Amino acid sequence: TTYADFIASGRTGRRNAIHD
Amino acid sequence: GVKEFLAKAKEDFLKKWESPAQNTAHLDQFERIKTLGTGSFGRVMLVKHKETGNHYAMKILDKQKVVKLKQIEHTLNEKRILQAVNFPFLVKLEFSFKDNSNLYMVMEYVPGGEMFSHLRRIGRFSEPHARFYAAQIVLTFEYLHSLDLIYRDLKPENLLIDQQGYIQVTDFGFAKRVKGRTWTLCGTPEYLAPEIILSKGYNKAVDWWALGVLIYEMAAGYPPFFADQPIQIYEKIVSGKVRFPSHFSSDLKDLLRNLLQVDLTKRFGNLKNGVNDIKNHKWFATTDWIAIYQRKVEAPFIPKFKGPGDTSNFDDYEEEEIRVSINEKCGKEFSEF
Ligand SMILES: Nc1ncnc2c1ncn2[C@@H]1O[C@H](COP(=O)(O)OP(=O)(O)OP(=O)(O)O)[C@@H](O)[C@H]1O
Ligand SMILES: [Mg+2]
Ligand SMILES: [Mg+2]
Questions:
Q1: Coiled-coil stretches, from where to where (chain B)?
Q2: Pairwise CA distance, residues B225 & B223, whole Å
Q3: What is the domain partition of chain B in residue ranges?
Q4: Which of B24, B72, B188, B214 has its CA 20 to 30 A from that of A17?
């Protein structure tokens, strides 16, 4: 499932902004 | 109505934009309690104002780090714009000041936590729940865009839940007053519009794309474009193909197809009818826009509240000493702060 793939991914925690 | 309101709102904003408040408190006036959150640039701490006993949230930026990360003009934008705005869903800046080492922005403390933490824990929001938050962002962008302000970092981490269950937008770090195109690569990867990724000049339409991402993530429980690394995310965004959960209503899918739209001649928010293409869309048909503005709608949920300075709705963070050098850093760069 998409949910399972998201939860197993490396970006489920807080996401900080990017720059440069 | 909204027209007269926005007219007065612009009059009020321009006075503060042209004469910004500066140096309105000092670090020694606050007891520092606990870190509430951190980002790429700043640390935000719960503080208690010694004279009044009020709690606030204080954003601390190290001047030297702001310089290294090429955020000088952005940070000046952030404070100049946040001190000048006034809207029911925008966090209030109460004080700002600087010392030898740091910049400080003392905000109202929004105690219900980030939308992010509630969303991840609960899994996903029902469509009426997502709609209640989305409506507040729609009204907030209508207000910001009318002042020629682009926001540029919509995401659950930057949205706080107040004691009445309403949204407070925080983190004006990429906010900019601009009448034409702008070009800076900034935002958060999952939320970037394709025209940002492709280094085009872009405009306030990128906020409406980001609203599409937010509504999708709220209603699905995951973003429309996700991967393990930003480069992979950017490939998916520029590909532009979105898949929707089976449980998404026909109306929600139609709205999202019009927000997550690569073609700027077709993206809602950007067209001749402006924000009304969104407000009058079928997914929002049950929304009473004045009632939302007036905060008269009963919220989907009310954060737990245990005391004035309770921080239970926030994650714990490693604490770091606030050091203040005996030498002034970056004086010229931040003269106007
Ligand atoms: N007024 C507030 N009340 C409570 N918590 C807040 C407040 N403002 C910010 N925070 C918390 O502090 C965190 C970091 O603040 P902010 O987003 O302004 O920092 P940043 O360095 O600009 O982050 P980003 O990487 O998103 O640019 C927020 O995600 C939120 O958890
Ligand atoms: Mg942030
Ligand atoms: Mg920021």
A1: none
A2: 5
A3: 1-19+114-304, 20-113+305-335
A4: B24
